[PDB]
Amino acid sequence: SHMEELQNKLEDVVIDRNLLILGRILGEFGSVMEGNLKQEDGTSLKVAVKTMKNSSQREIEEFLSEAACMKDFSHPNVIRLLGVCIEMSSPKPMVILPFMKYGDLHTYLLYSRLETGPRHIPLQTLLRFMVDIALGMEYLSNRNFLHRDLAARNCMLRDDMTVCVADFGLPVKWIAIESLADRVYTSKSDVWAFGVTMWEIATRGMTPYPGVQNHEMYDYLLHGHRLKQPEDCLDELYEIMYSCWRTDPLDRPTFSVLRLQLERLLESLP
Numbered sequence: 001s002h003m004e005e006l007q008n009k010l011e012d013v014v015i016d017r018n019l020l021i022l023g024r025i026l027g028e029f030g031s032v033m034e035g036n037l038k039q040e041d042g043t044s045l046k047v048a049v050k051t052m053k054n055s056s057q058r059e060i061e062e063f064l065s066e067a068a069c070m071k072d073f074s075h076p077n078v079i080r081l082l083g084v085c086i087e088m089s090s091p092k093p094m095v096i097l098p099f100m101k102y103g104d105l106h107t108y109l110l111y112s113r114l115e116t117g118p119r120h121i122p123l124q125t126l127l128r129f130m131v132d133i134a135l136g137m138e139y140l141s142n143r144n145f146l147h148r149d150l151a152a153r154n155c156m157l158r159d160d161m162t163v164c165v166a167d168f169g170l171p172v173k174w175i176a177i178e179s180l181a182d183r184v185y186t187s188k189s190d191v192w193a194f195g196v197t198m199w200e201i202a203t204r205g206m207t208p209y210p211g212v213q214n215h216e217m218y219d220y221l222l223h224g225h226r227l228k229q230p231e232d233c234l235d236e237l238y239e240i241m242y243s244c245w246r247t248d249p250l251d252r253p254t255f256s257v258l259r260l261q262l263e264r265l266l267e268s269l270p
């Protein structure tokens, strides 16, 4: 029955192409399109459709396998995979996601500094964003799933302004020191990317390490330098993000420890 569990997950993740109607292109690695998904209750749902790219057997079965694992995730701060579709060329898979009208968190932070879009984001909400990602990441690491592409651009905003982790890997300034050197990736490397993500949130969308080029990053970190404390950022919050960048990956806290520290800090605000 150990294999029968994979077959169960496999049947579940596939969506009939006829239940899907494709809309306009939102982004042009593969495309992001809007779509309509006909549900079991007879009504249509607005969805986001991600199309992907070379073998028509092994790599496709690999996509279905990976998608079957992804649809098994069930947490309010992890994007939910609604299912997958396949379309053949003259070998193009599609992944079906809930439509997020508020978009990615990175764009939202940037828009908040311009007169038109969202208004100034206060400290409590910036901390609520960090708690939400920590909760989603905590769910993932406890299931032994590595994100491998954690950044503000890969976190999505739901209609109730809840953040969910998304766009799972497969970005040099999000990569842990040991991942740049030993080409090794663990949950401590996700914790490092999370600290960088927290810094993007606190700076309201600044690119990490201003004045340091991508090809200078490994030598920069090797000499002990880390991301600087953002202006008006709490010392406690900075200590939490800094703890994510400890040279020894074993010294870095887990997501569960980080989530707790962030919740206490949030509750402590007036």
Ligand SMILES: CN(Cc1ccc2nccn2c1)c1nnc(-c2ccc(-c3ccccc3Cl)cc2)o1
Binding pocket: 026, 032, 047, 048, 049, 050, 063, 066, 067, 070, 079, 081, 095, 097, 098, 099, 100, 101, 103, 156, 166, 167, 168, 170
């Ligand atoms: C496109 N995107 C972001 C998004 C979401 C929602 C949204 N609404 C409007 C615009 N939007 C944009 C997104 N978030 N998560 C994913 C994703 C993509 C691929 C896979 C995957 C990769 C390999 C094998 C199997 C799978 Cl299922 C998993 C998750 O993509």
